[PDB]
Amino acid sequence: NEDMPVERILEAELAVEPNDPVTNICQAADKQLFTLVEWAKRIPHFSELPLDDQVILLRAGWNELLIASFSHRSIAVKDGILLATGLHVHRNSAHSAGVGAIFDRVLTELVSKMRDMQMDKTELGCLRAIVLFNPDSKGLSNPAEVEALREKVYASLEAYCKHKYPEQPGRFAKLLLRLPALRSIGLKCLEHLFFFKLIGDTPIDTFLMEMLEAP
């Protein structure tokens, strides 16, 4: 650990930790986003990037990030998820409100897959980091820096995977490989939200409506 320390990323993880289901899952999101920025502050070298470059990175990854947070928090629950809000959303509850298709996708695609490999908070805070340092993000003034910094977050995560889990050679690869699925789910998660607003049926509070409001 010279430039990117595994622990510190993990510190930030520990540091940020906690009728119409749909309405609830939203109350929870605007609430989660507030806490997400701070989490981001807490990651090595994030704050060393101009605010504008920071805002594009946070706007760029709000879905993928909060998603994998709640997925991991859910490795405990049987069929369902636990909200930051402290409610539970069961599979039946979600299905009854028309959002089951996505719901099972999170649960099949992420939660069981995470849960199966017993992924630690370090490995979580580490992946979330590679999301945040997406150099492919649009409007990014120095793409070279973000890019390498991901080269840091990952040389660091690989090294750790070998140390803690040497018995399983393929741990590194398997973890990176839920990132495409993460991508996929987030985008599909976004659509739904535009539709809720487009309808205006679902109250959406200010911070959220903000991340839905265009650049």
Binding site: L51, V55, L58, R59, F207
Partner: peptide
């Protein structure tokens, strides 16, 4: 031009 988030990135 997204106020609250910039406000939250000062502190």
């Amino acid at each position: 031009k997204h106020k609250i988030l910039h406000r939250l990135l000062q502190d």
